[PDB]
Each structure stands twice: as C-alpha cells, then as structure tokens.
Amino acid sequence: EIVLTQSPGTLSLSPGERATLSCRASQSVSSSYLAWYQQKPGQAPRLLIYDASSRATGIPDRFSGSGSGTDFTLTISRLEPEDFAVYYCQQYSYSPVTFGQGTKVEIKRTVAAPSVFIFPPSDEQLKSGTASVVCLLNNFYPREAKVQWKVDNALQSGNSQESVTEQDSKDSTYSLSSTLTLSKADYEKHKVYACEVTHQGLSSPVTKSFNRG
Amino acid sequence: VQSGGGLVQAGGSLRLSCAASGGTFATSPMGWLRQAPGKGTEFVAAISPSGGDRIYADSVKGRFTISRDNAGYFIYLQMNSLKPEDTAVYYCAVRRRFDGTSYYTGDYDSWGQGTLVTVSSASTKGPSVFPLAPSSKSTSGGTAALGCLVKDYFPEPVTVSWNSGALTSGVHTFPAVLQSSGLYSLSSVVTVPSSSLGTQTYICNVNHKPSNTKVDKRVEPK
C-alpha cells in the first residue's frame, strides 16, 4: 500500500502568513489522485483539494495544491483565523485509500510562561479510597513543557495523566493538566507532594508543592 | 511466539498462548508479564517447570490462570472476567535468573515480543464531581485558581459550565482522557482574583446526559 507522510508535524505561523504543507508518498501516486482535507475538533474532515490541484466547490482561492509523483504541496496563501486547524493528505490512486498523519497549523504568539497551581485531593474524594492531585499549567506558549511529579523527592512514573486544551481563541495560549492518581493508602504513606514544571518562558523550573494535611 | 490477544469488552475472556520458538523450555520455570499503556512492566503470573507451583499478581489473582503442557511447547494464560485495568501488552518470559522471588520481573527474560490486549468498558456511568479548592487564601493578592474534577464517567461527553453560564472568562475545561479504568476524567478550572473569593460563589454545573447525572458543586477553601 501507499504510505503517505506529512511534514512538518506542526507549523507555527502568524495570521496572514503563508503556510506551505508537504505530503510525501512511498511510491508514485498515479494520475495525481491526491486530496487535501482540513480537520477541526469534533468535525469530519472537510475536502479542500482533489486531483492534487482542484478546489472543491466553495473552497476559497487561498487554498491551492500542487505536486505529482511522490511529492505534493498544499499552500494556504494567507492564514485567516478559521484556517488554523489540522490538514491531511489522502491518496485514492491504489486501494486501500490511505491518509497522512496530519500537519497542525497553530497560531504563533510571543513566548508566555505558565502559571502553575497545585490542588490536593478533596476530603470527599479520599473517602472514596482514591486520591487525585492536580497540577495546572495555565496560559503558556509554546505548547511544549515537562511536568514531573515528585513524592518525597521521588520521581514518579506511570501514575499520572496529562491533558492539554486547544489553543485559546482569544490569546493563543495553551493550558495543561497533569493528574497524579493513587490510592488513599499510598497517599497518606507520604509527606511532600510537588509538581515541577520546565518551560521555555521560565528562567528555571518552577515547583509548586504542599505537605499533606 | 504469541497469539490470542486483541479487543474484548469488560466481562470478556481471552486465552493468550506462548509457543516455544526453539522447541523446549520444558525444564525452565515460565512467567507472563504485562506493560499497560503509558506504564512499566509488571508481573502477572508464573509457573514452575512441572506445572505444580503457580503464582499470580494480586491484581489478577482469582481471574487469571497460568497453565502449560508437558512437552514444553506451550504455556498459557487464561484471562477471565476482564477489567479495563487489564488493558496492556502481555508477554511470556523464561525465568533465567534467581536474584530474588518468583514475583521479581527482573529474573525473567523475554525477546521483545508482545500481544496487545484491550478491554473496552461498556456501561453508562455518571461522574463524581470533586472540588479543586482555591490555591491561595482570600487574603493573599494576585490570581487564584480553582476548579472541578469531573471523574469516572462513560461515555463521552459531559457538559461543564460555571454558575449555570454566569462565569465564562478564565475558564478552561480540559479534554476528557480515558483513565486506565476505561472511564473518562477531566478537570474544569477557572482563574479569578484572590480578593474576590469569599464574596462570590463558584459552582460547576456538570451535566452527563447519557445518564441524566447532573451535579452542581460548590468549590470553597479547605
């Protein structure tokens, strides 16, 4: 089958800039049967281009496609606010139809450090036998960060889950939650609960913490 | 060489198999280990060369059975009453060292093979809603954060709002993530002025329609 790969994985660009997205095929895509889609959360992909360079009906002029063989390009000549989304290439030259893994186009803004907060588990929850401790990283950019849990200076692994909001529509920041889940037994066997955050906007990692009380 | 994994629903059963890719581990004690997604290796079960002693992780004791044949071609793991917690990549291994107990994963040797086993929850369940108490006192200055932890529900989605729609700016409702229990969990948080805390009421309105679970929870200091 034809394997499609897209590059880059993420484009960070300002509104109004041009975006150039690449699609490479593992072998030749005959007759340029290549399509591009835009995808937004909770929505089915929206066909932009087919036959490598033909706009679907009602698609704005600023979306244009080119390429042939094993190399294709989607150009978005001007990024409107509604254009920051995920973009996928698809070949329909040989069965099975295959899809690329997507290129995310996000809004570039100035680097913003996260505000970090830590929340102990509530009395209510412990009574259920489980304890969740939440670390919040609020309104940061770019998206990348490192978040380590330390319990009595012990680096924790395998027991925490992360989640990240979509880029904020007003200020183009991201927020992140890391939730460390353990039983009540394992909770009150320990004293120091700390969240350590490394981010480009910070001169050195910030740690927020509490002692279980 | 392995087989017998895949997708099954909570309350299903699978029987993984471990075929000798060289003819005989008939005289060697054998074990099954698993590595859950985003997790490390953990012991599952083991069995002595004769098939006499049989040993089981606490988490699977009662439900899983390890067994073998006499020619040392096949070791099995019968997995009954499957939980979402059992979702993992499983592999058998030959106990080639004796650095401690038969529970010690470090004594067992494998060769990179695995079988993926996934257990998909089914029931309609409403969430528990816990408060994320404000991060500073109402006497401190700057910005305070608080929220609601909306935990252990299935399926998607839940709706979360603050003060039935009165508070929206500063709100971040995180995408639901599937816990290891096959139930979703998310937090909704909001930032507010510290000075304001004691003079306003912050309540998340969680509504899980699939179960007509609809909870409102006051979030206050500890």
CSV table of C-alpha atoms in Angstrom, one decimal:
chain,number,residue,atom,x,y,z
A,1,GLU,CA,0.0,0.0,0.0
A,2,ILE,CA,1.0,3.6,-0.4
A,3,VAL,CA,2.3,5.2,2.8
A,4,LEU,CA,1.9,9.0,3.0
A,5,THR,CA,3.9,11.1,5.3
A,6,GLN,CA,3.4,14.8,6.1
A,7,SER,CA,5.9,17.4,7.0
A,8,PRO,CA,6.3,19.3,9.2
A,9,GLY,CA,4.2,17.9,12.0
A,10,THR,CA,3.4,21.4,13.3
A,11,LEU,CA,3.5,24.8,11.6
A,12,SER,CA,3.5,27.9,13.9
A,13,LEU,CA,2.6,31.0,11.9
A,14,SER,CA,1.0,34.4,12.4
A,15,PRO,CA,-2.4,35.3,11.0
A,16,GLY,CA,-2.0,36.4,7.4
A,17,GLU,CA,1.2,34.5,6.8
A,18,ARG,CA,1.5,31.8,4.1
A,19,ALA,CA,1.6,28.2,5.0
A,20,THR,CA,3.3,25.5,3.0
A,21,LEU,CA,2.4,21.9,3.8
A,22,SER,CA,4.2,18.8,2.3
A,23,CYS,CA,2.9,15.3,1.5
A,24,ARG,CA,5.3,12.6,0.5
A,25,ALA,CA,4.2,9.2,-0.9
A,26,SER,CA,6.1,6.0,-0.5
A,27,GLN,CA,5.6,5.3,-4.2
A,28,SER,CA,4.1,7.2,-7.2
A,29,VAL,CA,0.5,8.4,-6.9
A,30,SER,CA,-0.9,7.8,-10.4
A,31,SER,CA,-2.9,10.5,-12.2
A,32,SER,CA,-2.3,12.8,-9.3
A,33,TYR,CA,-5.2,11.3,-7.4
A,34,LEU,CA,-4.3,13.2,-4.2
A,35,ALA,CA,-6.7,15.1,-2.0
A,36,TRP,CA,-6.3,17.5,0.9
A,37,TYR,CA,-8.6,17.9,3.9
A,38,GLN,CA,-8.9,20.4,6.8
A,39,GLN,CA,-9.9,19.0,10.1
A,40,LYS,CA,-11.2,20.7,13.3
A,41,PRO,CA,-12.0,19.1,16.6
A,42,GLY,CA,-15.4,17.3,16.6
A,43,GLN,CA,-15.8,17.7,12.8
A,44,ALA,CA,-15.5,15.5,9.9
A,45,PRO,CA,-12.6,16.4,7.6
A,46,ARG,CA,-13.5,19.0,5.0
A,47,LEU,CA,-12.3,18.4,1.5
A,48,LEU,CA,-10.2,21.2,0.2
A,49,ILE,CA,-8.5,19.9,-2.9
A,50,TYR,CA,-8.8,16.8,-5.2
A,51,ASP,CA,-6.8,15.7,-8.2
A,52,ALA,CA,-3.9,17.4,-6.4
A,53,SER,CA,-4.8,20.9,-7.5
A,54,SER,CA,-8.6,21.3,-8.0
A,55,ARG,CA,-10.6,23.2,-5.3
A,56,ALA,CA,-13.8,21.6,-4.2
A,57,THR,CA,-16.9,23.8,-4.5
A,58,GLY,CA,-17.0,26.8,-2.2
A,59,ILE,CA,-13.4,26.4,-1.1
A,60,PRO,CA,-11.6,29.8,-1.0
A,61,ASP,CA,-8.9,30.8,-3.5
A,62,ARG,CA,-6.2,30.9,-0.8
A,63,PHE,CA,-6.1,27.1,-0.7
A,64,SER,CA,-4.1,25.8,-3.6
A,65,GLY,CA,-2.5,22.4,-4.4
A,66,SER,CA,0.4,21.3,-6.5
A,67,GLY,CA,2.8,18.4,-7.0
A,68,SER,CA,3.0,15.0,-8.7
A,69,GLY,CA,4.7,11.7,-8.4
A,70,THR,CA,5.7,11.3,-4.7
A,71,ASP,CA,5.7,15.0,-3.6
A,72,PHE,CA,2.7,17.2,-3.1
A,73,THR,CA,2.1,20.6,-1.6
A,74,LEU,CA,-0.8,22.4,0.0
A,75,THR,CA,-0.4,26.2,0.1
A,76,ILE,CA,-2.6,28.4,2.2
A,77,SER,CA,-1.6,31.8,0.7
A,78,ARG,CA,-3.0,33.7,3.7
A,79,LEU,CA,-3.9,32.3,7.1
A,80,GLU,CA,-7.3,33.5,8.2
A,81,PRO,CA,-8.4,32.9,11.8
A,82,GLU,CA,-10.5,29.9,10.7
A,83,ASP,CA,-7.6,28.3,8.9
A,84,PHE,CA,-5.6,27.2,12.0
A,85,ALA,CA,-6.5,23.5,12.0
A,86,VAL,CA,-5.1,20.1,11.1
A,87,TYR,CA,-4.5,19.3,7.5
A,88,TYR,CA,-4.4,15.8,5.9
A,89,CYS,CA,-3.4,14.4,2.6
A,90,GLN,CA,-5.0,11.3,1.1
A,91,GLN,CA,-4.3,9.2,-2.0
A,92,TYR,CA,-7.0,7.5,-3.9
A,93,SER,CA,-4.9,6.0,-6.7
A,94,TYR,CA,-4.5,2.5,-5.3
A,95,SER,CA,-6.6,0.6,-2.8
A,96,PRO,CA,-6.6,1.0,0.0
A,97,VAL,CA,-7.1,4.7,0.1
A,98,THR,CA,-4.5,6.0,2.6
A,99,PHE,CA,-4.1,9.1,4.7
A,100,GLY,CA,-1.2,11.1,6.0
A,101,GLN,CA,-0.8,11.6,9.8
A,102,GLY,CA,-1.6,15.3,9.6
A,103,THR,CA,0.1,18.7,9.9
A,104,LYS,CA,-1.2,21.0,12.6
A,105,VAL,CA,-1.2,24.7,11.8
A,106,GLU,CA,-1.2,26.8,15.0
A,107,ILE,CA,-1.0,30.4,15.8
A,108,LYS,CA,2.4,31.7,16.8
A,109,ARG,CA,2.4,34.2,19.6
A,110,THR,CA,5.1,35.5,22.0
A,111,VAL,CA,6.6,33.1,24.5
A,112,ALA,CA,4.4,33.1,27.6
A,113,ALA,CA,5.4,31.2,30.8
A,114,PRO,CA,2.8,29.1,32.6
A,115,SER,CA,1.2,30.0,35.8
A,116,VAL,CA,1.4,26.8,38.0
A,117,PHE,CA,-1.0,25.8,40.6
A,118,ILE,CA,-1.3,22.5,42.6
A,119,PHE,CA,-4.5,21.1,44.1
A,120,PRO,CA,-4.7,18.5,46.8
A,121,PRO,CA,-7.4,15.8,46.7
A,122,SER,CA,-10.6,16.8,48.5
A,123,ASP,CA,-11.7,15.3,51.8
A,124,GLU,CA,-14.8,14.0,49.9
A,125,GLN,CA,-12.6,12.1,47.4
A,126,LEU,CA,-10.3,10.4,49.8
A,127,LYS,CA,-13.3,8.9,51.5
A,128,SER,CA,-13.8,7.0,48.2
A,129,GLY,CA,-10.3,5.4,48.8
A,130,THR,CA,-8.7,7.2,45.8
A,131,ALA,CA,-6.7,10.5,45.7
A,132,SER,CA,-6.2,12.7,42.7
A,133,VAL,CA,-3.7,15.5,42.8
A,134,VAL,CA,-3.9,18.0,40.0
A,135,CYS,CA,-1.2,20.3,38.7
A,136,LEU,CA,-2.4,23.1,36.4
A,137,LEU,CA,-0.2,24.9,33.9
A,138,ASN,CA,-2.1,27.9,32.8
A,139,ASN,CA,-1.9,30.1,29.7
A,140,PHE,CA,1.5,29.2,28.3
A,141,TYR,CA,3.1,29.2,24.8
A,142,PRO,CA,4.6,27.3,23.0
A,143,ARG,CA,2.9,24.1,23.7
A,144,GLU,CA,5.9,22.0,24.9
A,145,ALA,CA,6.6,21.5,28.6
A,146,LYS,CA,7.8,19.0,31.1
A,147,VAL,CA,5.9,18.1,34.2
A,148,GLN,CA,7.3,15.8,36.8
A,149,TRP,CA,5.6,14.6,39.9
A,150,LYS,CA,7.9,14.2,43.0
A,151,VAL,CA,6.7,12.5,46.2
A,152,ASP,CA,9.3,12.9,48.9
A,153,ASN,CA,11.8,13.9,46.2
A,154,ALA,CA,10.9,10.6,44.4
A,155,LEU,CA,10.4,11.0,40.7
A,156,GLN,CA,7.1,9.4,39.8
A,157,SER,CA,6.2,7.5,36.7
A,158,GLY,CA,3.3,5.6,35.2
A,159,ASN,CA,0.7,7.0,37.5
A,160,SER,CA,0.0,10.5,36.0
A,161,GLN,CA,-2.2,11.6,33.1
A,162,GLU,CA,-1.9,14.8,31.1
A,163,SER,CA,-4.4,16.7,29.1
A,164,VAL,CA,-4.0,19.9,27.0
A,165,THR,CA,-6.6,22.4,25.9
A,166,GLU,CA,-6.9,23.6,22.3
A,167,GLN,CA,-5.2,26.8,21.5
A,168,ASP,CA,-7.2,29.6,23.2
A,169,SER,CA,-9.2,31.5,20.7
A,170,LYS,CA,-8.5,34.9,22.4
A,171,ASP,CA,-4.9,34.8,23.5
A,172,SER,CA,-3.4,31.8,21.6
A,173,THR,CA,-2.1,30.1,24.7
A,174,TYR,CA,-2.4,26.6,25.9
A,175,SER,CA,-3.2,25.2,29.3
A,176,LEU,CA,-2.2,21.7,30.7
A,177,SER,CA,-3.4,19.5,33.5
A,178,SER,CA,-1.3,16.6,35.0
A,179,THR,CA,-3.3,14.4,37.4
A,180,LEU,CA,-1.4,12.0,39.6
A,181,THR,CA,-3.8,9.2,40.8
A,182,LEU,CA,-3.0,6.9,43.7
A,183,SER,CA,-5.0,5.1,46.4
A,184,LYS,CA,-5.7,6.7,49.8
A,185,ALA,CA,-3.3,4.1,51.3
A,186,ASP,CA,-0.4,5.2,49.0
A,187,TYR,CA,-1.4,8.8,49.6
A,188,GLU,CA,-1.0,9.1,53.4
A,189,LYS,CA,2.1,7.0,53.3
A,190,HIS,CA,3.8,10.2,52.1
A,191,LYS,CA,4.5,13.8,53.0
A,192,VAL,CA,5.7,16.1,50.2
A,193,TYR,CA,3.7,16.4,47.0
A,194,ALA,CA,5.4,18.5,44.4
A,195,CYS,CA,4.8,19.4,40.8
A,196,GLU,CA,7.9,20.5,38.8
A,197,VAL,CA,7.5,22.4,35.6
A,198,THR,CA,10.0,23.2,32.9
A,199,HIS,CA,9.1,25.6,30.2
A,200,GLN,CA,10.9,28.0,27.8
A,201,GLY,CA,9.3,31.0,29.3
A,202,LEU,CA,10.8,30.2,32.7
A,203,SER,CA,14.4,31.1,33.6
A,204,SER,CA,14.4,27.9,35.7
A,205,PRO,CA,11.9,25.2,36.6
A,206,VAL,CA,9.1,26.2,38.9
A,207,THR,CA,8.0,23.8,41.6
A,208,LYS,CA,4.7,24.1,43.4
A,209,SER,CA,4.0,21.8,46.4
A,210,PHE,CA,2.1,21.0,49.5
A,211,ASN,CA,2.5,18.8,52.5
A,212,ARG,CA,-0.5,16.5,53.0
A,213,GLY,CA,-2.6,18.0,55.8
B,1,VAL,CA,5.9,-16.8,19.6
B,2,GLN,CA,2.5,-15.5,20.9
B,3,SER,CA,-1.2,-15.1,20.0
B,4,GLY,CA,-4.7,-14.8,21.4
B,5,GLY,CA,-4.9,-11.1,22.3
B,6,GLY,CA,-7.0,-8.2,20.9
B,7,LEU,CA,-10.1,-6.3,21.7
B,8,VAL,CA,-12.8,-7.6,24.1
B,9,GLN,CA,-15.4,-5.8,26.3
B,10,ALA,CA,-15.4,-5.6,30.1
B,11,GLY,CA,-16.5,-9.1,31.3
B,12,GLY,CA,-15.0,-10.8,28.3
B,13,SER,CA,-12.3,-13.5,28.4
B,14,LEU,CA,-9.1,-14.3,26.4
B,15,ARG,CA,-6.6,-17.1,26.4
B,16,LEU,CA,-3.1,-16.0,25.4
B,17,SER,CA,-0.7,-18.6,24.2
B,18,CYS,CA,3.1,-18.8,24.3
B,19,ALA,CA,4.6,-21.2,21.7
B,20,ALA,CA,8.3,-22.3,22.1
B,21,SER,CA,10.2,-20.8,19.1
B,22,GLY,CA,13.1,-23.3,19.8
B,23,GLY,CA,11.3,-26.5,20.8
B,24,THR,CA,11.8,-26.7,24.6
B,25,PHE,CA,11.5,-24.5,27.6
B,26,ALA,CA,10.1,-27.7,29.2
B,27,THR,CA,12.6,-27.7,32.1
B,28,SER,CA,12.5,-23.9,32.8
B,29,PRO,CA,10.1,-22.0,35.0
B,30,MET,CA,7.9,-19.6,33.0
B,31,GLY,CA,6.1,-16.4,33.5
B,32,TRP,CA,3.7,-13.9,31.9
B,33,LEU,CA,4.3,-10.2,32.3
B,34,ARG,CA,2.4,-7.1,31.0
B,35,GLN,CA,3.1,-3.5,30.2
B,36,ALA,CA,0.0,-1.3,30.3
B,37,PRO,CA,-0.2,1.8,28.1
B,38,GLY,CA,2.0,4.6,29.4
B,39,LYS,CA,3.0,2.1,32.1
B,40,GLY,CA,6.0,0.0,33.1
B,41,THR,CA,6.4,-3.8,33.1
B,42,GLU,CA,4.5,-5.6,35.9
B,43,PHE,CA,4.4,-9.2,37.0
B,44,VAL,CA,1.3,-11.2,36.0
B,45,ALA,CA,1.8,-14.9,36.7
B,46,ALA,CA,4.4,-17.7,36.8
B,47,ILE,CA,4.6,-21.5,36.8
B,48,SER,CA,7.4,-24.0,37.9
B,49,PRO,CA,8.9,-26.4,35.4
B,50,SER,CA,6.5,-29.2,36.5
B,51,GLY,CA,3.3,-27.1,36.5
B,52,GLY,CA,3.0,-27.5,40.2
B,53,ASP,CA,3.6,-24.1,41.8
B,54,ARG,CA,1.5,-21.4,40.3
B,55,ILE,CA,1.8,-17.7,41.3
B,56,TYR,CA,-0.3,-14.6,40.5
B,57,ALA,CA,-0.2,-10.9,40.8
B,58,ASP,CA,-2.6,-9.6,43.4
B,59,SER,CA,-4.5,-7.6,40.7
B,60,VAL,CA,-5.3,-10.7,38.7
B,61,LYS,CA,-5.4,-13.4,41.4
B,62,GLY,CA,-8.8,-15.3,41.1
B,63,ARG,CA,-9.4,-14.3,37.5
B,64,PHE,CA,-6.3,-15.4,35.5
B,65,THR,CA,-4.9,-19.0,35.2
B,66,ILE,CA,-1.5,-19.9,34.1
B,67,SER,CA,-1.0,-23.4,32.7
B,68,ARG,CA,1.4,-25.4,30.5
B,69,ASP,CA,1.9,-28.6,28.6
B,70,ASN,CA,4.4,-31.4,29.3
B,71,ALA,CA,6.5,-31.2,26.1
B,72,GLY,CA,7.4,-27.6,26.9
B,73,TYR,CA,6.0,-26.2,23.7
B,74,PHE,CA,3.0,-24.2,25.1
B,75,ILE,CA,2.4,-22.0,28.1
B,76,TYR,CA,-1.0,-20.4,28.5
B,77,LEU,CA,-2.6,-17.6,30.4
B,78,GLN,CA,-6.4,-17.9,30.7
B,79,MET,CA,-7.7,-14.4,31.4
B,80,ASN,CA,-11.3,-14.4,32.7
B,81,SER,CA,-13.7,-11.6,33.9
B,82,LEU,CA,-11.5,-9.0,32.1
B,83,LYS,CA,-11.4,-5.4,33.5
B,84,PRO,CA,-10.3,-2.3,31.7
B,85,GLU,CA,-7.3,-2.3,34.1
B,86,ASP,CA,-6.1,-5.4,32.3
B,87,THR,CA,-5.6,-3.4,29.1
B,88,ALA,CA,-1.9,-3.9,28.3
B,89,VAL,CA,0.7,-5.6,26.0
B,90,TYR,CA,1.4,-9.1,27.5
B,91,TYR,CA,4.4,-11.3,27.0
B,92,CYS,CA,5.7,-14.6,28.4
B,93,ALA,CA,9.2,-14.9,29.6
B,94,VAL,CA,11.7,-17.5,30.7
B,95,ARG,CA,13.0,-17.2,34.3
B,96,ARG,CA,16.7,-17.4,33.6
B,97,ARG,CA,18.0,-15.9,36.9
B,98,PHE,CA,17.3,-16.3,40.6
B,99,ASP,CA,18.1,-12.8,42.0
B,100,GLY,CA,15.1,-12.9,44.3
B,101,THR,CA,11.5,-14.0,44.4
B,102,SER,CA,9.4,-15.6,41.6
B,103,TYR,CA,7.5,-12.3,41.6
B,104,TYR,CA,10.6,-10.3,40.5
B,105,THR,CA,10.2,-9.3,36.9
B,106,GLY,CA,14.0,-8.7,36.6
B,107,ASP,CA,14.5,-12.5,36.9
B,108,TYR,CA,12.6,-13.1,33.7
B,109,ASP,CA,13.9,-12.9,30.2
B,110,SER,CA,11.9,-12.1,27.0
B,111,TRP,CA,12.9,-11.1,23.5
B,112,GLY,CA,10.7,-8.1,22.5
B,113,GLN,CA,7.6,-10.0,21.5
B,114,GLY,CA,4.2,-8.9,22.8
B,115,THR,CA,0.4,-9.4,22.4
B,116,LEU,CA,-1.9,-6.3,22.7
B,117,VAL,CA,-5.0,-6.9,24.8
B,118,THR,CA,-7.6,-4.2,25.1
B,119,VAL,CA,-10.7,-4.2,27.3
B,120,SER,CA,-13.3,-1.7,26.4
B,121,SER,CA,-15.7,-0.5,29.2
B,122,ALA,CA,-19.4,-0.5,28.2
B,123,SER,CA,-21.7,0.8,31.0
B,124,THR,CA,-23.3,4.2,31.1
B,125,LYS,CA,-22.0,5.9,34.2
B,126,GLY,CA,-22.2,9.4,35.6
B,127,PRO,CA,-19.3,11.3,37.1
B,128,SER,CA,-18.3,12.0,40.6
B,129,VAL,CA,-17.5,15.7,41.0
B,130,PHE,CA,-14.8,16.8,43.4
B,131,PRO,CA,-13.7,20.4,44.2
B,132,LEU,CA,-10.3,21.7,43.4
B,133,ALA,CA,-10.1,24.1,46.3
B,134,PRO,CA,-8.7,27.6,45.7
B,135,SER,CA,-4.9,27.8,45.5
B,136,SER,CA,-4.4,30.7,47.9
B,137,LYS,CA,-6.3,32.3,50.7
B,138,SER,CA,-8.8,35.1,50.3
B,139,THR,CA,-6.3,37.5,52.0
B,140,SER,CA,-3.3,37.0,49.6
B,141,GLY,CA,-3.4,39.1,46.4
B,142,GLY,CA,-2.7,38.1,42.8
B,143,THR,CA,-4.7,35.4,41.0
B,144,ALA,CA,-6.4,32.3,42.4
B,145,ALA,CA,-7.2,29.1,40.6
B,146,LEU,CA,-9.9,26.7,41.4
B,147,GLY,CA,-11.9,24.1,39.6
B,148,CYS,CA,-13.9,20.9,39.5
B,149,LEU,CA,-12.6,17.4,38.9
B,150,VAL,CA,-15.2,15.5,36.9
B,151,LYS,CA,-14.1,11.9,37.2
B,152,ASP,CA,-15.2,8.4,36.4
B,153,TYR,CA,-17.9,8.7,33.7
B,154,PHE,CA,-18.7,7.0,30.5
B,155,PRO,CA,-19.3,7.5,27.6
B,156,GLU,CA,-18.4,10.9,26.3
B,157,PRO,CA,-19.4,13.7,26.6
B,158,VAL,CA,-20.1,15.8,29.7
B,159,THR,CA,-21.1,19.4,29.7
B,160,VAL,CA,-19.4,21.7,32.3
B,161,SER,CA,-20.3,25.3,33.0
B,162,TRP,CA,-19.8,27.7,35.8
B,163,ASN,CA,-22.7,29.3,37.7
B,164,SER,CA,-25.1,27.9,35.1
B,165,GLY,CA,-23.5,30.1,32.5
B,166,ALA,CA,-22.6,33.3,34.5
B,167,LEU,CA,-18.8,32.7,34.6
B,168,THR,CA,-17.0,32.0,31.3
B,169,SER,CA,-13.9,34.1,31.1
B,170,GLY,CA,-10.8,32.4,32.5
B,171,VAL,CA,-12.5,29.0,32.2
B,172,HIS,CA,-10.6,26.0,30.8
B,173,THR,CA,-12.4,22.7,30.5
B,174,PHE,CA,-9.8,20.1,29.7
B,175,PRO,CA,-10.4,17.4,27.1
B,176,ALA,CA,-11.6,14.2,28.6
B,177,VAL,CA,-8.9,11.5,28.9
B,178,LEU,CA,-9.7,7.8,29.2
B,179,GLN,CA,-8.3,6.6,32.5
B,180,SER,CA,-6.8,3.2,33.0
B,181,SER,CA,-10.3,2.2,34.4
B,182,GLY,CA,-11.9,2.7,30.9
B,183,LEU,CA,-13.8,5.7,32.3
B,184,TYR,CA,-13.2,9.3,31.3
B,185,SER,CA,-12.0,12.1,33.6
B,186,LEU,CA,-11.4,15.8,33.2
B,187,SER,CA,-10.9,19.0,35.1
B,188,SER,CA,-12.6,22.3,34.6
B,189,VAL,CA,-10.6,25.2,36.1
B,190,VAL,CA,-11.0,28.9,36.3
B,191,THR,CA,-8.8,31.7,37.4
B,192,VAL,CA,-10.2,34.5,39.5
B,193,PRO,CA,-8.9,37.4,41.6
B,194,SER,CA,-7.8,36.2,45.0
B,195,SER,CA,-9.5,39.2,46.7
B,196,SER,CA,-12.9,38.1,45.3
B,197,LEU,CA,-13.1,34.6,46.7
B,198,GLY,CA,-15.2,35.0,49.8
B,199,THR,CA,-17.6,37.3,48.2
B,200,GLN,CA,-18.7,35.1,45.2
B,201,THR,CA,-19.9,31.6,44.7
B,202,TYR,CA,-18.2,29.3,42.3
B,203,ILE,CA,-20.2,26.2,41.2
B,204,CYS,CA,-19.6,23.9,38.3
B,205,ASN,CA,-22.6,22.6,36.6
B,206,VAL,CA,-21.8,19.2,35.3
B,207,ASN,CA,-24.4,17.5,33.2
B,208,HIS,CA,-23.8,14.0,31.9
B,209,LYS,CA,-26.8,13.4,29.6
B,210,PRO,CA,-26.3,9.8,28.7
B,211,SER,CA,-27.1,9.0,32.3
B,212,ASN,CA,-29.1,12.1,33.4
B,213,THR,CA,-26.5,12.6,36.0
B,214,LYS,CA,-26.5,16.4,36.6
B,215,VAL,CA,-24.4,17.7,39.5
B,216,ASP,CA,-23.7,21.2,40.8
B,217,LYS,CA,-20.8,21.5,43.3
B,218,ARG,CA,-19.7,24.5,45.4
B,219,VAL,CA,-15.9,24.9,45.5
B,220,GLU,CA,-14.6,26.6,48.6
B,221,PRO,CA,-11.4,26.6,50.8
B,222,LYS,CA,-10.4,23.7,52.9
